[PDB]
Amino acid sequence: GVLKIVKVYLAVKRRIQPGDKMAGRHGNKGVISKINPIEDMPYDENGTPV
Amino acid sequence: QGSVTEFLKPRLVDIEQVSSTHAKVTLEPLERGFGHTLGNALRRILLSSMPGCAVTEVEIDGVLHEYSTKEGVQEDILEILLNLKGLAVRVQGKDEVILTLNKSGIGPVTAADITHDGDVEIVKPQHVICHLTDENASISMRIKVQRGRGYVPASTRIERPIGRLLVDACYSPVERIAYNVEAARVEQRTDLDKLVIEMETNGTIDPEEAIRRAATILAEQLEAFVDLRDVRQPEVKEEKPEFDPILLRPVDDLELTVRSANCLKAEAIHYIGDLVQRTEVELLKTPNLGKKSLTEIKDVLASRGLSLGMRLENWPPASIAD
Amino acid sequence: MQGSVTEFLKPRLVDIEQVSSTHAKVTLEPLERGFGHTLGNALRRILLSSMPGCA
Amino acid sequence: GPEEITADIPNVGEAALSKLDESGIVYIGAEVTGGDILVGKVTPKGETQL
Amino acid sequence: KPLVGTGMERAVAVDSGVTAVAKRGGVVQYVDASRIVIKVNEDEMYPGEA
Amino acid sequence: EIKELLKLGDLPTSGQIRLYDGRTGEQFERPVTVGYMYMLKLNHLVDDKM
């Protein structure tokens, strides 16, 4: 009981968002909660934000 | 108390222009203590408090969206637009300038291949936009430069193909600000230092006017203590979001006659908001109404709290948004 | 300015609550994300260092 | 009654016409929000009797 | 690639069969970012015979 | 072996560089270490969706 079929993909570009988990190769499991602004972000001598 | 020039007044003694991009200016008259409090109250005044200009909207002749890959291109439709993010152009005194790009054949598309506008000053003509592999492949975009307040996410931005694919932005001139100590070498006394500010601007705003502007912002942030004739109110805003859902009600809530219930609906009137927007001076022109058919409506609107000649909000209500 | 370069609101003193002859109140409502720690540190090193007086 | 997919739909709106234009199907790459139309559908209901 | 390694990250991407590996010498005709065609020299130079 | 190599670089050799505070402005007591770390962003499972 079907004439034809129409397939439509749905690609989503998931961007960074506070809620995921980050872990390298050593096992430093962590989680982002609050994004630290650049204004109140200390730096070195030459001026390089962390 | 006294107050009579007890400290030294900072004055521009000598500037250093090591490069056309980076400079090393410095002041001399600085007491031990002001070489840090003035450097800290400036380091955070040029990381987001700077206008600048950058690329935001782009057209591309051939590509429809960030998925369609244009032929005759080494990279994909994505990477070739990421290059425009680095493309910096300083505008004389405009906010909306449309630039056109056009060329053919092999060779990296430089920034000098774009149209030459008088009000448009190219910073780095040797800027690469896209590489053409096929000699028969052409490339053309409508790169326009605006003036935001630093960075504009594409996700926040983006029917029919008009603006199509867009890119990010980076109006922020300098990306890093640093400060050094260093003891000044005057000919008067010994206890004197020098600020010395290092700035790495993309090439839009020269360091000499950028640093001075930074301190100017702080000056205006204290003009209320210098006793100046500036009588302006701070913030007198009153926010309390409210609306009138009753206006979204049809005209069948005013108790009318069959006559008016057939004349109004025939004149594109289904809601009470579609009638108030008009005036009782143009409705008399239609050979299907009158003056008694308007004064009767206003009589009922008196209880609802509505009347002819009033603006509307959130109208029309929920419809068929395309 | 006249060339429209500021585009930001600048704070200003309005009222001085004089509860005493030495202690008072200095409010500053008009502030932004960043200037809160700027003015709070640009004067902190003055009212606790560069102050005449006598004792 | 078996329904069919086509760009020319006897709808009372236009939102379903802005997308579907390539004779039944829709062009590739665009931008809107969730709760729209992907593939035009015309399925009569109530035996075409109000 | 990480700044430091052991020298075993290369042998992985090879046996896994991730990157394309040519099985015959010859020049490259096209280098599109979606399709690549390599012409071999086993037949007489002909626009439709190779 | 590494300690001997750390002699070059830029200027430091122990890793602890002087960090200037962007908040108060006063330098942080006892310099901290700054370098490159190999991390990774693990996929965000949909089993923890709101």
Which residue in C13, C8, C4 sits closest to C35, CA to CA?
C8
The reply to whether omega before B153 is within 30° of 0 (cis) is: no
CB atoms within 10 A of CB B130: 21
Chain F residues in contact with E1 by the CB 8 A cut-off are none
| Alpha carbon distance B226, B218 (integer Å) | 13
Torsion region of B52: left, alpha or beta (phi above 0 gives left; psi -120 to 50 gives alpha): left
Collapsing DSSP states into helix, strand and coil, what is residue E31? strand
Q: Is A27 left (phi over 0), alpha (psi -120 to 50) or beta?
A: left
Give the chain D residue whose CA is nearest to the CA of B319.
D13
Residue E19, classed as helix, strand or coil, is coil
Instruction: Report d(CA B210, CA B46) in Å as an integer.
Output: 8
How far is residue B148's CA from residue E24's CA, in Å, rounded to a whole number? 54
Strands E36-38 and F16-17: unpaired
Could you please state the CATH topology (level 3) that the domain comprising B231-317 is classified under: DNA polymerase; domain 1 (1.10.150)
Q: In this structure, are residues B55 and B109 in contact, taking their beta carbons and an 8 Å threshold?
A: no
Query: Alpha-carbon torsion B248, B252, B256, B259, what sign?
Result: positive
What are the start-end ranges of the E strands in chain D?
20-22, 25-26
Q: Are B297 and B254 in contact (CB under 8 A)?
A: yes
Characterize B9-41 residue by residue with b for buried, 16 or more Cβ atoms within 10 angstroms of its Cβ, and e for exposed. ebeeeeeeeeeeeebebbbbbbeeebbbbbbbb
**Strands in chain C per DSSP E:** 16-17, 25-26
| Residues of chain A neighbouring F31 (CB-CB closer than 8 A) | none
Element of type H or E holding B212: helix B207-220
DSSP string, B124-189: -TT-----B-STT-EE----EEE--SS---HHHH---SSS-SB------S-S-EEE---B---SS-
Each domain of chain B, given as residue ranges in start order, spans 4-51+172-230, 52-171, 231-317
Cα dihedral E3, E7, E10, E11, rounded to 10, equals -160
CA distance C31 to C9: 8
Closest CA of chain D from A12, distance in Å: 12
CATH topology of domain B4-51+172-230: Gyrase A; domain 2 (3.30.1360)
DSSP-derived secondary structure for chain A:
-----------------TT-EE--SS---EE------STT--B-SS----
Distance between CA atoms of residues B277 and A17, nearest Å: 45
Cβ neighbors of B55 (< 8 A, separation 6 or more) are B84, B85, B87, B89, B143, B144, B145, B167, B169
Chain A residue with minimum CA distance to B45: A39
Resolution of this PDB entry, in A? Answer: 19.8
CB-nearest partner of B48 from A39, A47, A48: A39
Cβ-based neighbours of E26, under 8 Å, separated by 6 or more: E38, E39, E40, E41
B312 is written with which tokens? Answer: 């509307």
Burial class (CB in 10 A: 0-12, 13-18, 19+), B113: middle
User: Token pair for residue D10?
Assistant: 């006897």
How was this structure obtained? cryo-EM
d(CA E6, nearest CA chain B) in Å: 31
Contact call for residues B161 and B170 (beta carbons, < 8 A):
no
D–F touching, 3+ CB–CB pairs within 8 Å? no
> What does chain B come to in residues?
322
May I ask the CATH architecture of the domain B52-171? Beta Complex (2.170)
Which residue on chain C is closest to B33 by alpha carbon? C45
Phi, psi of B83 (to 5 degrees): -70, -30
From CA B283, how far away is CA B278, in angstroms rounded?
8
Q: Are B84 and B55 in contact (CB under 8 A)?
A: yes
Task: Quickly tell me which residue has 């193909």 as its tokens.
Answer: B161
CA pair distance E11, E6, nearest whole angstrom? 11
Dihedral sign for Cα atoms in the order B42, B48, B51, B54: positive
Contact C41/A at CB under 8 A? no
Measured CA to CA in angstroms, residue B322 lies from D13, D14, D25, D27 at distances of: 9, 7, 17, 16
